[model samples]
Target: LMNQIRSQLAQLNGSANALFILYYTAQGEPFPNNLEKLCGPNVTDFPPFHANGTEKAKLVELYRIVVYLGTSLGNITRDQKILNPSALSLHSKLNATADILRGLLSNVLCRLCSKYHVGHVDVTYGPDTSGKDVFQKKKLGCQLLGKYKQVISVLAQAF
Candidate 1:
């Protein structure tokens, strides 16, 4: 059962990290090396709290959700219940939390793309570039956006 708990923790950590990296990458930013640096100063081009309205709110919420989950995983590692049988009972709860976290991430991503006019070829590639390379990159970005939306829909149903 302890192994089960560890597996769930790994799953949670991996999913959270994957989503985090995807968002930053889509924004043309580097992967945040740590949770504290996840929303570092000026890491994004989006306007500050006042100018972006609900977009800013969603960003903050997403940051908080990731931080909370990361903190929870840290706490679990420090706890000794892993060596005890009682810890097995936490498997379901951990799985549920992970699912909810992923769902929330999907929701935020969907909202960000819709609000900012992201994922469109013109927005991603710009009209200034007119080569075959630019066209391919734009196509790839659009493809990624479509896949992201699919993941969002599937995860959203877990809510």
Candidate 2:
């Protein structure tokens, strides 16, 4: 499922400056491009997610996320570079790219939490923090998880 998303995003004619992949169980957001490339001219337009008690809220959230992701990609491309550079290194570039995406997604998620006045915003899942999976299946209820599953959940409904 995620592979498809990466492929689609990658094919966006330089639309995405970087990629990110997040697993159910993983930690930290790695870098694909330099830090400077993580953001672009659209930085100010990206806002945190919030519940406005309306159907359009979801659409707004979706737009916010898309814009945020694009900005992040731009920032990464403009700034940071891959660490421990190697020509034949066996590290999975795909995974690294996914991590970068996940990090940016997490950042938007954190912004959503703040916007909605939600209490929990896990940073361990933020860019570079490592540990258990940031999105714990057990921690987040099944019903709520279904409504708000993965990064896309934040944009699915208006809080």
Candidate 3:
């Protein structure tokens, strides 16, 4: 039920904030390698949720974007490779929160697949890395966190 989803959404918000602060603390350090860091800017990309079709479908679409953003966040952080022990600890927490969100969204989808309708996407839930090189992992993480907060806020009001 939504109980799980709601709980995880709360966790998502908390961890996103925590990770943001952790990354901010690491500003200009070897943790992000300082060059796996570039400003070539993956800045052209945009947020990917649309609010139409059905409410449930909207939620599913939101979930898909979450999947994509979460994947991207995971990679951008991993790309650093230096492992700022604390930053990574926060990263892992945020990821576990996201991982929980992914599983819970699917759980709701499975329950609804037969009841009315469920939004559909054929995705493997991995980072699409082709454009990742241009993005500064920390900047990208900041933007990704911003997007997640915006998105989760909408989802929060919905439920």
Candidate 4:
């Protein structure tokens, strides 16, 4: 799955290092060399956050991470000769890039919830659904919640 994420981004119009820089930097982790750590064996399955305590934090982290990568890093690396996309085209490309990352990270979180037998809560439905049926989906709900913030931040960065 990590390889899939890297491969997708590598095929894009910018250097993978630039993307990595943005991703790691936003996670409050070291950049450049820590790419492996983000999804490597060193990291835990679900980031070690309780369903209630860490969900919001995880979402915000991923959002800011990917968004910064796509926008800030995108601009910084635009001149590296990947494809030389116009400013507008690059914006579109980065938007798609952040979206893909969002989905991948969300899927990872969901899988962790499933593996740990953790209960799911619809973070989207607000605190009201904290223990509702939406919470019964476990992995699915966790992923949805985790990636929600990524979407927002990524979009904001693109703009």
Candidate 5:
């Protein structure tokens, strides 16, 4: 189960990282290793995980943040036309990325449940896109995804 969990974590990160890249593409912004410029110190902080909590619940929280970031980027690309779409089918690419991400999230959920009772998690709905800057979502998403990746790195190490 250790190896299985490790592999799952790897898969999750692949989708997680890929989604971040697409957002960069959406912004036509070159990859910026440091996302703090736009993130402006407001990037997510996993205090619960950092200080105290079950790894399973922390995993749930991390993925939920991933979902919001992914969905926000996904929704933005869908609801607004991309000015710098790297590919003509950019939306499809983003859609597929989200699809794979959900599958991995489901797989991890099932594995954890089979291993231990979760009690429950407040799975957030798709992001509310009203009045959001379509392009800034891509910018914001870059940092959001960066933070998700950052938090998950620790979770992966601990789990």
Candidate 6:
């Protein structure tokens, strides 16, 4: 059972890595023309949306996958009949993965905030766009970070 859990977690980790890479590459202006070249064929079901749309959609999709995997890990750990020394270690592994997922989410959110001012409004009517939106976006990013942190904390404590 433990081996199975580890295998599933490994798959989840791989998926997360792929999602992050795709998202990172999509962040550039005039987004990469060939996502298939970048992400490989069918790694993700590319959305039929513009670059910005694809970015937001994929970010949410990745978040959902992480949360689902975290929940599955919790269920596996909870349903174990016998508690052994290795069980404790497995729980630790789950928490570590949760931490990784949280960090990934935070990184993506911060990048989006910095690049696109996601979740923040631009107040200035000036031509200077540099650093004009950072403060507001930073606040938004921290709020999102806190939310992801809480989700990870809850999932980790379930074990």
Best by TM-score: 3
Which 10 residues in a row give candidate 1 its minimum summed lDDT?
A: 120-129
TM-score of each: 0.31, 0.28, 0.67, 0.28, 0.62, 0.34
For model 6, residues 14-44, the per-residue Cα lDDT tens digits are: 4434333333232333224533333232212
Put down candidate 1 lDDT per residue, 1-159, tens digits, no spaces. Answer: 223323433454445434433433433322334323433322122212222345445355333434344333333322313322343334333344446556544544554456565442211211221234533333332333233333333322222
Better of 1 and 3 by lDDT: 3
Give the range of the ten consecutive residues with the poorest summed lDDT in model 5: 39-48
TM-score, structure 2 vs. true: 0.28
Clash pairs detected, candidate 6:
none
Residue-pair clash count for candidate 4: 2
Q: Per-residue lDDT tens digits of candidate 2, residues 107-128?
A: 4455455555544432211132
What value does the lDDT take at residue 46 in candidate 4? 24
Query: Candidate 3: deviation at residue 19, Å?
Result: 2.1
User: RMSD (Cα, Å) of candidate 3?
Assistant: 4.9
lDDT per residue for candidate 5 within 56-119, as digits (tens), equals 6656765565556556556555553555545545556556656656665676667566777764
Sort the predicted structures by lDDT, highest score first.
Answer: 3, 5, 6, 1, 4, 2
How many clashing pairs per prediction, in order?
0, 26, 0, 2, 0, 0
The residue ranges of model 6 lying beyond 4 angstroms of the native Cα positions read: 1-53, 71-86, 120-159
What TM-score, to 2 decimals, does candidate 1 have?
A: 0.31
> Tens-digit lDDT track for model 3 on 1-159?
667767666676666656555554554454345423432224345345554456666656656656676676666556544545455666565666557767765765664574666545544564455454434455666555555655666665555
Tens-digit lDDT string for candidate 4 (90-147): 3443455556666655653554355544444332211222333422222222222234
Q: What is the lDDT of residue 29 in candidate 4?
A: 28
lDDT for each of the candidates?
Answer: 0.37, 0.33, 0.57, 0.36, 0.57, 0.37
The segments of candidate 2 whose C-alpha lies over 4 angstroms from its true place after superposition are 1-46, 82-153, 156-159
